[PDB]
Write a protein that holds these residues in place. Structure first.
Motif, PDB file in Angstrom:
ATOM      1  N   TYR A  61     -21.035   1.455  12.652  1.00 23.03           N
ATOM      2  CA  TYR A  61     -20.744   1.911  13.999  1.00 23.03           C
ATOM      3  C   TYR A  61     -21.747   1.303  14.998  1.00 23.03           C
ATOM      4  O   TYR A  61     -21.359   0.617  15.927  1.00 23.03           O
ATOM      5  N   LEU A  90     -15.967   5.525  18.415  1.00 28.01           N
ATOM      6  CA  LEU A  90     -17.331   5.204  18.755  1.00 28.01           C
ATOM      7  C   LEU A  90     -17.861   6.255  19.712  1.00 28.01           C
ATOM      8  O   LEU A  90     -17.374   6.417  20.829  1.00 28.01           O
ATOM      9  N   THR A  91     -18.834   7.004  19.231  1.00 31.63           N
ATOM     10  CA  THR A  91     -19.358   8.172  19.938  1.00 31.63           C
ATOM     11  C   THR A  91     -20.252   7.808  21.133  1.00 31.63           C
ATOM     12  O   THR A  91     -21.105   6.920  21.049  1.00 31.63           O
ATOM     13  N   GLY A 141     -25.035   5.809  12.255  1.00 31.30           N
ATOM     14  CA  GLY A 141     -24.148   6.389  13.270  1.00 31.30           C
ATOM     15  C   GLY A 141     -24.738   7.581  13.992  1.00 31.30           C
ATOM     16  O   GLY A 141     -25.913   7.924  13.806  1.00 31.30           O
ATOM     17  N   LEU A 192     -19.747  15.468   8.953  1.00 36.14           N
ATOM     18  CA  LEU A 192     -19.005  14.406   9.619  1.00 36.14           C
ATOM     19  C   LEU A 192     -18.283  14.927  10.858  1.00 36.14           C
ATOM     20  O   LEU A 192     -18.182  16.123  11.082  1.00 36.14           O
ATOM     21  N   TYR A 220     -15.417  10.209  22.006  1.00 40.40           N
ATOM     22  CA  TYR A 220     -15.403   8.769  21.790  1.00 40.40           C
ATOM     23  C   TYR A 220     -15.024   8.085  23.088  1.00 40.40           C
ATOM     24  O   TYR A 220     -14.175   8.599  23.826  1.00 40.40           O
TER      25      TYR A 220
HETATM   26  N1  LIG Z   1     -18.486   8.128  15.436  1.00 40.61           N
HETATM   27  C1  LIG Z   1     -19.839   7.938  14.845  1.00 40.61           C
HETATM   28  C2  LIG Z   1     -19.757   7.553  13.360  1.00 40.61           C
HETATM   29  C3  LIG Z   1     -19.392   8.687  12.433  1.00 40.61           C
HETATM   30  C4  LIG Z   1     -20.539   9.644  12.199  1.00 40.61           C
HETATM   31  O1  LIG Z   1     -21.689   9.283  12.513  1.00 40.61           O
HETATM   32  O2  LIG Z   1     -20.278  10.790  11.757  1.00 40.61           O
HETATM   33  C5  LIG Z   1     -20.553   6.840  15.607  1.00 40.61           C
HETATM   34  O3  LIG Z   1     -19.992   6.328  16.575  1.00 40.61           O
HETATM   35  O4  LIG Z   1     -21.676   6.470  15.285  1.00 40.61           O
END
Ligand SMILES: N[C@@H](CCC(=O)O)C(=O)O
Ligand SMILES: NCCCNC(=O)c1c(NC(=O)Cn2nc(C(F)(F)F)c3c2CCCC3)sc2c1CCCC2
Ligand SMILES: N[C@@H](CCC(=O)O)C(=O)O
Lengths: 262, 262
Positions: A61, A90-91, A141, A192, A220
């Motif tokens: 990520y 993507l957070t 991440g 998660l 996201y």
């Molecule tokens: N969506 C997260 C990845 C998944 C997670 O870290 O649980 C990120 O953008 O880093």
């Protein structure tokens, strides 16, 4: 100058982007399916660009190496000019916001707990106060960073445990985390994002459960290199898709319409 | 040049900004309390500015007059240079995003249904398919625009009804909408943001209920005049406050800690 093919970085993460089962028989963008495949098509249509879907080389990520200060994953791809846009789960985080641009969120989520059904855990507090059940996160991440950075007693305690647990409680991919929950007879819980957790809860063999409330609340965003002229129309396109109900429709499509557990 | 006092537009809307009961005895910012009063203080501290809280002159959120094309409410205040920033439950929408800047969301919400307890309504579909119970929205805000613009059959049907209902189903303020639900013996349901709905459900006399799921999913943003150099640090401050748990703490403070219905 002339319009160029927009290079989209994304990640193989179900149900956001998946190989079609007949992918060997197909070319270019047609190889892939999922929420973000559909979203990329909508964004491109509304902004009027041609695009190429690519899967992030390192499968990550994005995180900055504390020693090299180099960004990896999709974030790295944008920062170093290897992709023009990231259309992925993507957070939006402070540290990423400083180095890349993000649209307004197209999907909300929070950190959540995945257990094998019947695991005697209801909350993060429960996890923190026992040792028999191991728990960890994805590395590279926003979830891992969350625990690392948290000042909140329960999360601080969890981090102290996870960072030094043996054997390692961290996984390279979401599918690994799920495989560990499923195969560990309830002796591993996986932290998660609630989106991924809720998708897997509706997939055979229907042996996992999201438990308790979310640990945080965020979203996201579609990401662009800092200052890219793409950011503006892409952001406006996300707001239109939200206001038209299209984002909700795409979530229903990929989570619940095809849901395998009733 | 020299730092200036940042003029903040906001709205009297509980529990975001409220007059202190002893407000007559106080001056300037000290007159007010609430979620956004606390948030303004945090944002100002992190960005290092001095500020003056002001209540929007016309008591509105912001809409563009179809005839004059003039923006009213807090949105108008920003567009015409009367305020430097809006720190309020101001919904991020496409039409507003075009004319002002917004931070990433500091609070999420969706349109929701408020009924007096025991009203035989479970959903928007229920409302749409009957006539005995009137329903409406706040005028000059994102909820009204939602119904006006919706292509979704149920919401389109609701709009056709509301826009021509007699007597009028629209209200000037949230407190009016609530007063109508409470005094109409279940013959009026009020469509409002789930945040306001959930706050009122915890206020005496505990006679209202949020029913069914939300009709949409979105967020409030801190808004600045388009291009303002304030937007960047304010956005980063919102992300820090989110990641520190401060936003969650402020929501708990103003919704649930002081909750009056058990
Ligand atoms: N969506 C997260 C990845 C998944 C997670 O870290 O649980 C990120 O953008 O880093
Ligand atoms: N509870 C602590 C903070 C609460 N957070 C939010 O509401 C919040 C977010 N909320 C949302 O994204 C909710 N949200 N907000 C919108 C928007 F942008 F307002 F249109 C949309 C959604 C969901 C569906 C697409 C459209 S994203 C985010 C935060 C905080 C950190 C940065 C990323
Ligand atoms: N938050 C809304 C006002 C409340 C409503 O429309 O329900 C706005 O910014 O316009």
């Amino acid at each position: 100058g002339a319009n160029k093919t927009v290079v989209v970085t994304t990640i193989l993460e179900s149900p956001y982007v998946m190989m079609k089962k007949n992918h060997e028989m197909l070319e270019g963008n047609e190889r892939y399916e999922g929420y973000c495949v559909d979203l990329a098509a909508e964004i491109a249509k509304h902004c009027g660009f041609k695009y190429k879907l690519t899967i992030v080389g390192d499968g990550k990520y994005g995180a900055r190496d504390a020693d090299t200060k180099i960004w990896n994953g999709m974030v790295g791809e944008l920062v170093y000019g290897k992709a023009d846009i990231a259309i992925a789960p993507l957070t939006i985080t402070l540290v990423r916001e400083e180095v890349i641009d993000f649209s307004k969120p197209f999907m909300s989520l929070g950190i959540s707990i995945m257990i094998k059904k019947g695991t005697p855990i209801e909350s993060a507090e429960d996890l923190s106060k026992q040792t028999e059940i191991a728990y960890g996160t994805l590395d590279s991440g926003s979830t891992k960073e969350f625990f690392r950075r948290s000042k909140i007693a329960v999360f601080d305690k969890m981090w102290t445990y996870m960072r030094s647990a043996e054997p390692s409680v961290f996984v390279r991919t979401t599918a690994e985390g799920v495989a560990r929950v499923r195969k560990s007879k309830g002796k591993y819980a996986y932290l998660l994002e609630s989106t991924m957790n809720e998708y897997i809860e509706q997939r055979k063999p229907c042996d996992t459960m999201k438990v308790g409330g979310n640990l945080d609340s965020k979203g996201y965003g579609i990401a662009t290199p800092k200052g890219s002229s793409l950011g503006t129309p892409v952001n406006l396109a996300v707001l239109k898709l939200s206001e038209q109900g299209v984002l909700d429709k795409l979530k229903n499509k990929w989570w619940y319409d095809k849901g395998e557990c009733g």
